[PDB]
């Protein structure tokens, strides 16, 4: 009824410990969601074309051209680690767990409140808020996954991360097909390159409507909506990282000399002349058996063209890479292609007392050593005469195509049947949790945005919309906008996310890396004297595991 | 209760496939309906007489004289194709099906909201909207078809075609009896032709009221009304067209000289002199057996007097024709009598963002070839002397009654026992779906407005009305209009229309016509940058079928 | 999820576009470029890569001689202009048993190039490589364009 509650607030985390070292992590998240009525009740096909920014030669990477359908519906997205776990929960998980499974997900909407706003004619403005007990909130769950998948973590538009702060749903939109061409250039290119928006291919048009595709529930103040429990079918996610590159695979060489006194410069020596050694190499025209030249089982990682931009029907885009840079852990300034950079607002980690439109940003440097250090690569002639001469070697300091700033490693790909690589680590709190698999016939081996990828399906998207609240002057044949009472809704959202994790075992004599509080990061986890909060980022794959 | 929803919004279309190539098409439509309190609570008997327009000689076809009963009720009519199908569903139906059956219809009203309007006495006007929880909406279902049948598609007054656009019902009115005489004339006619409204014949007076004939349900904010499933008894509707005229029935003549080379002018020849041929003709006094004179089983189509106006007690009206014109499919400018013209507004297809009172119009050119090419006909004397002389042939070029613009084909009827014709095709989105059969002893073979005609009876009309909300100063003895609290209602209408259709089969080597999205019509099916929408007319009988 | 448009058009026409509104270095989102603040449609992270670039009209040799390197996807812009159909678009040559007009004389086969509706190809004239630093606007020495020998 009007005065009866339809649900309970729960933002607790439960750790039920099953048999055989497994734990059943249940994460409950409850939010107060504020929803305003849409700016228009209509679907808009809008086209963006920043020809002013791209008309500057050399700015082709700043292209924003696209077409999208703008919908009156809003999306309630909880696909971010911060919606479920606070820093203590994350510390427990990443310090005590070895692997993580995604089990089930359910959500519900309860305690719906719809209000109206009326402004007086008094010369000094004043306005009052009234309940509309008969107003309804439209709710649609796309359980069949008919609508385009639009995960909000990409735009930092999921639900907030604080149980005690109200949150909002992101207005919903999806990409409408367009054709675009942009010929790249540089500062000093003669003429204006081709920079044209071509229009839309009729064979690719897809105008989706929530009304025509999803059942819609009308909720009054006494109604509730529950989705039911969806069960995932994803692969396990590892909370451990690999440090072994190809140089650390297999039996090391026997040291026929070992140091007799401890010290930095007291090295051990193999003691066998290099071309007189025993072992296996994949180089049939040399007798040198060295650490660089000895055969290894396979490859760990792969070189890829970095900051390579590829063009298709819709315009340029960056070629994605599955691993981060080498040497970035030692020097953060060297973090580059492959190290994901997140920008976010005050709902999602930025100090809440800060003023200004500038977001908080961090580049996520992962602990796994699967990257490449391109400054250390080189090609050389098949003859393999050592020491190598200038004409028989290609170094990263060597111009490709006549350019002093482009070398061979920029256009270099070594992905092959021998490549081994890991899935992307989880990123707390701004990282996406699960992603839908592409509907291509042949599927990618991994996703760069989520550690969990859904094979068959995973949960439909939850859309909300304040139902139209018309005045007495409505005329559907009028060309002007709809006359509506200023109406908005506040409703409570509760979700349950279930994980299954495996407790870790100490395999080594030494202790491992763990997340801890210290004097430096002490005040990143508590409120300020004026109530400000922040959620800094945390690394996930702390513990090391042996690759081979 | 006040805060509990009484129904769910559903506007999906389901295609459940059955055995033997039959599909159970379930179309769901849900609207938000805006209803105002009527201008008056009283029934009116109103006479319209545009003597000014018909006083000009030659304007008799512009007669608008009639008498109607203006009721305070409003009609919730969903009897148009666009209320149930969007362009994609229509494409699927018309491209993959051969015949359509109308099965069942049901509708329900839920989530009733009644609001009142109050205007402040402040010098700058302002007004507020309040909920009247005790107010009622009067709902009447005429399940016994006691009231006159007044389908709204004929006036373009059905529910809107867009699920996301609130719609309105049409104020209900029905014809009263009147006697009218209007003697036709032309510019230059001497004197004033008789143009007189005669009154009402008492033997034909029929004054229907909803209250004395139909149960009325008083719905408060927490109430819902459901009609119950109705089941039709109509004939199947064909989604194929016939191209065979009389000239294309039977066995073509044997060609004794087949062409020896490709080309447009490389024709074949029968090779037998026309007066020495074998076959059957109904011309017992001539030896010529020619394609025009050879016997055929029956007649496909018929000639009717076109732009003929017939006068009965109530005044002139156009004589309808079951088939369209000939040659109109090659030249749209030749579309005339028989090709329906639909004039509609922004609720029913006209681009919603356009201003002005001008309606959107289209003339439907059916794919069927059952029409006539009146300028290709002629009549000649029974003797059949060829080549025919002037005095023995009546041509469309020749005058009738001394008129240079009227020829014998204007007064010509060739309907007979040998006439074969087709039913009217569905017209999307603006066409009627079903119509009621006339209560005459002898009934028409087809209706020219709806492909489905209801043999016994079919669903009762749904009437809605805001119950009077009186002030404290009501006095039934006063002659002035009742003083009411300005009240309007918004309620949700959901309807389910079920069809049965048969999947088509390929019977020919060549492919057939299909409706498709192309670069020309691409933007008729997607919204504009400011939300504009339109629904364009689509043909229905795309595939051909052999008549004989 | 496309970017939220803070400015929407108020009239219909070819010059009425929508605007994101947020300055490019002030935007929120995820990029795979740890050394820049620019979140743009060409730089924002995507789940994976649709299609791939392959060496086109590449001939490789083995024991039996040279053969073309096959490719799984067609070209970009082939649908827009059929004269651009190239590597990746299968070209079929056939005679009068298998489709060629049967009444035509001569030994010339009937041919067509198949342009698929799937958009998984590439527009190599639109690709470019630029130095990791990513200083914009890019200068000549720090970009490798398809126009470069």
């Amino acid at each position: 009824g009007v005065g009866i509650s339809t649900g309970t607030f729960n933002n607790q985390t439960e750790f039920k410990f099953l048999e055989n070292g497994w734990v059943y992590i249940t994460a409950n998240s409850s939010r107060l969601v504020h929803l305003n009525m849409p700016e228009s009740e209509n679907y808009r096909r809008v086209v963006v074309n920043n020809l002013d920014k791209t008309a500057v030669n050399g700015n082709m990477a700043l292209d924003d051209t696209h077409a999208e359908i703008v919908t009156p519906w809003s999306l309630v997205d909880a696909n971010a680690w911060g919606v479920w776990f606070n820093p203590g929960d994350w510390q427990l998980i990443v310090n005590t767990m070895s692997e993580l499974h995604l089990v089930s997900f359910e959500q519900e909407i309860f305690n719906v409140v719809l209000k109206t706003v009326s402004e007086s004619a008094t010369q000094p403005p004043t306005k009052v808020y009234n309940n509309d007990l008969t107003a309804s909130l439209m709710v649609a769950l796309d359980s069949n996954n008919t609508m385009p998948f639009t995960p909000a973590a990409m735009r930092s538009e999921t639900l907030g991360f604080y149980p005690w702060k109200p949150t909002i749903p992101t207005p919903w939109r999806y990409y409408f097909q367009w054709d675009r061409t942009l010929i790249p250039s540089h500062t000093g290119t003669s003429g204006t390159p081709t920079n044209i928006y071509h229009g839309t291919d009729p064979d690719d048009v897809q105008f989706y409507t929530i009304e025509n595709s999803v059942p819609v529930h009308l909720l009054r103040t006494g109604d509730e909506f529950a989705t039911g429990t969806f069960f995932f079918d994803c692969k396990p996610c590892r909370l451990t990282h690999t440090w072994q590159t190809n140089r650390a695979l297999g039996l090391p060489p026997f040291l026929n000399s070992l140091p007799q006194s401890e010290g930095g410069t007291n090295f051990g020596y193999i003691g066998v002349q290099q071309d007189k050694r025993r072992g296996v190499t994949q180089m049939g025209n040399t007798n040198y058996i060295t650490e660089a030249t000895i055969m290894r089982p396979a490859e760990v990682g792969y070189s890829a063209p970095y900051y390579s931009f590829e063009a298709s029907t819709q315009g340029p885009f960056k070629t994605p890479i599955a691993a981060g840079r080498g040497g970035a852990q030692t020097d953060e300034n060297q973090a580059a292609d492959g190290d994901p950079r997140y920008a976010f607002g005050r709902q999602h980690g930025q100090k809440t007392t800060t003023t200004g439109e500038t977001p908080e940003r961090f580049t996520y440097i992962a602990h796994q050593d699967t990257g490449r250090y391109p400054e250390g690569d080189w090609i050389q002639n098949i003859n393999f005469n050592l020491p190598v001469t200038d004409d028989n070697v290609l170094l990263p300091t060597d111009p490709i195509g006549g350019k002093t700033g482009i070398n061979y490693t920029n256009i270099f790909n070594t992905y092959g049947p021998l490549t081994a690589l890991n899935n992307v680590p989880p990123v707390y709190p701004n990282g996406q949790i699960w992603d839908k698999e592409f509907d291509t016939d042949l599927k990618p081996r991994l996703h760069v945005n989520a550690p969990f990828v859904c094979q068959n399906n995973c949960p439909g998207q939850l859309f909300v919309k304040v139902a139209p609240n018309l005045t007495n002057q409505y005329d559907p044949d009028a060309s002007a906008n709809m006359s509506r009472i200023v109406t908005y809704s506040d409703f409570w959202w509760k979700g349950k996310l279930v994980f299954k994790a495996k407790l870790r075992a100490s395999h080594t004599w030494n202790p491992i890396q763990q997340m801890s509080i210290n004097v430096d990061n002490q005040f990143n986890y508590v409120p300020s004297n004026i109530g400000g909060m922040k959620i800094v980022y945390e690394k996930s794959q702390l513990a090391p595991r042996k690759l081979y | 209760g006040v805060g509990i929803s009484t129904g769910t919004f559903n506007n999906q279309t389901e295609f459940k496939f059955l055995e033997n190539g039959w599909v159970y098409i379930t179309a769901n439509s849900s609207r938000l309906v805006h209803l105002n309190m009527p201008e008056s609570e009283n029934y009116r008997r109103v006479v319209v007489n545009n003597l000014d327009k018909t006083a000009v000689n030659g304007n008799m076809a512009l007669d608008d004289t009639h008498a109607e009963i203006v009721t305070p009720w409003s009609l919730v009519d969903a009897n148009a194709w666009g209320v149930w199908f969007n362009p994609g569903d229509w494409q699927l139906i018309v491209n993959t099906m051969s015949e359509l059956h109308l099965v069942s219809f049901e509708q329900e009203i839920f989530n009733v909201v009644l609001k009142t309007v109050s205007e402040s006495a402040t010098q700058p006007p302002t007004k507020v909207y309040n909920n009247d929880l005790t107010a009622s909406l009067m709902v009447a279902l005429d399940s016994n078809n006691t009231m006159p049948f007044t389908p709204a598609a004929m006036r373009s007054e059905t529910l809107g075609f867009y699920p996301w656009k609130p719609t309105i019902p049409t104020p209900w009115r029905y014809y009263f009896q009147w006697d009218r005489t209007l003697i036709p004339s032309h510019t230059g006619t001497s004197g004033t032709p008789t143009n007189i409204y005669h009154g009402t014949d008492p033997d034909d007076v029929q004054f229907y009221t909803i209250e004395n004939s139909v149960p009325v349900h008083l719905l408060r904010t927490g109430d819902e009304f459901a009609t119950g499933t109705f089941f039709f008894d109509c004939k199947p509707c064909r989604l194929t067209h016939t191209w065979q005229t009389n000239r294309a029935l039977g066995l073509p003549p044997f060609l004794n000289s087949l062409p020896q080379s490709e080309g447009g002018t490389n024709f074949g020849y029968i090779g037998v002199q026309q007066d020495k041929r074998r076959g059957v003709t109904q011309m017992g006094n001539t030896n010529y057996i020619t394609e025009a004179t050879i016997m055929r089983p029956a007649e496909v189509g018929y000639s009717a007097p076109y732009y003929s106006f017939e006068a009965s007690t109530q005044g002139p009206f156009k004589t309808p024709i079951a088939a369209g014109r000939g040659g109109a499919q090659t030249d749209e400018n030749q579309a005339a009598d028989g090709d329906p013209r639909y004039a509609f507004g922004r609720q029913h297809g006209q681009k919603t963002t356009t201003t002005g009172e001008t309606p959107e119009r289209f003339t439907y050119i059916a794919h069927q070839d059952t029409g006539r090419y009146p300028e290709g006909d002629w009549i000649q004397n029974i003797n059949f002397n060829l080549p025919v002389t002037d005095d023995n042939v009546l041509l469309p070029t020749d005058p009738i009654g001394g008129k240079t613009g009227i020829n014998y084909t204007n007064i010509f009827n060739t309907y007979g026992p040998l006439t074969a014709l087709n039913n009217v095709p569905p017209v999307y989105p603006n066409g009627q779906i079903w119509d009621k059969e006339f209560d005459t002893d002898l009934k028409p073979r087809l209706h020219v407005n709806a492909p489905f005609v209801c043999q016994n009876n079919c669903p009762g009309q749904l009437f809605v009305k805001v119950a009077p909300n009186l002030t404290n100063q009501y006095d039934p003895d006063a002659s002035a209009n009742m003083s009411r609290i300005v009240t309007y209602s918004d309620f949700w209408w959901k309807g389910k229309l079920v069809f049965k259709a048969k999947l088509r089969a390929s019977h020919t080597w060549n492919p057939i016509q299909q409706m498709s999205i192309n670069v020309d019509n691409q933007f008729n099916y997607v919204p504009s940058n400011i939300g504009g929408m339109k629904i364009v007319y689509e043909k229905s009988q795309l595939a051909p079928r052999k008549l004989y | 999820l496309p970017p939220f448009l803070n400015s929407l058009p108020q009239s219909e026409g070819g010059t009425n576009f929508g605007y994101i509104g947020v300055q490019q270095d002030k935007r929120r989102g995820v990029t795979q470029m740890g050394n820049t603040n620019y979140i743009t449609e060409a730089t924002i992270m995507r789940p994976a890569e649709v299609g791939y670039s392959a060496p086109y009209y590449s001939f490789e040799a083995s024991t039996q001689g040279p053969f073309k390197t096959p490719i799984a996807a067609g070209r970009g812009g082939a649908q827009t202009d059929e004269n651009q159909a190239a590597d990746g678009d299968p070209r079929y040559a056939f005679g009068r048993q298998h489709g060629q007009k049967t009444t035509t004389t001569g030994e010339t086969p009937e041919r067509f190039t198949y342009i698929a509706h799937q958009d998984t190809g590439r527009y190599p004239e639109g690709d470019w490589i630029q130095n990791i630093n990513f200083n914009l606007p890019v200068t000549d020495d720090n970009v490798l364009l398809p126009t470069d020998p």
Partner: antibody
Amino acid sequence: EVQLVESGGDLVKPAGSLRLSCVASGFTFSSYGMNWVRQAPGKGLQWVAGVNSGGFTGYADAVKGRFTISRDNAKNTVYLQMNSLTAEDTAVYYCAKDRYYCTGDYCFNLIAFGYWGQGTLVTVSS
Amino acid sequence: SVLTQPTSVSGSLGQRVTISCSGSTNNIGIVGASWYQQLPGKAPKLLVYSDGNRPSGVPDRFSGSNSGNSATLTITGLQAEDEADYYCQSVDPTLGVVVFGGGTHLTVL
């Protein structure tokens, strides 16, 4: 090779109306826009109007309130309708094709005529 | 919006010729000019695109460049084939209006 042919030239009164037509061939007609450019005697080229695949049109400020342009992709034909003509409209009108593929509402951001017809003469006088 | 061109330009056989077209940030500063050739009484012919490319069969003699709000057409190795009239064409994206220049007559000495 691409080829265009125009027609419709005539002499009309200082306040009449006229209609012109071009026929095209040799390319994907629906993919490229077609434009009307005129040249007064002894003067330079002047743009009149252009129409794209979906029927969207653009008119110069000199003719925006008077003229109308249309297509028929099933017939590879482009028409121009002129109303309320004045003496200044006298010129030879040339029918041309765009180098760039644009179809819908958002054209006229990059135009470059790559093929041309033969031209037709329009004379406005008493 | 209108573009500006010099009335005439003169060059001698074998020399270099330059023709200049001036516009604004609204027309040439976003979409560069495209250059056309017109023999007396004949239909125009496109010479150089806005990006410096030429239609198939146009000699490399013809070249173009864009700087700020001004564009230029350069004809190298002037031959007797080049005596004609030349025009600059640009489109205004703000208004959606195609803009031609006034035209320049080329004299070969």
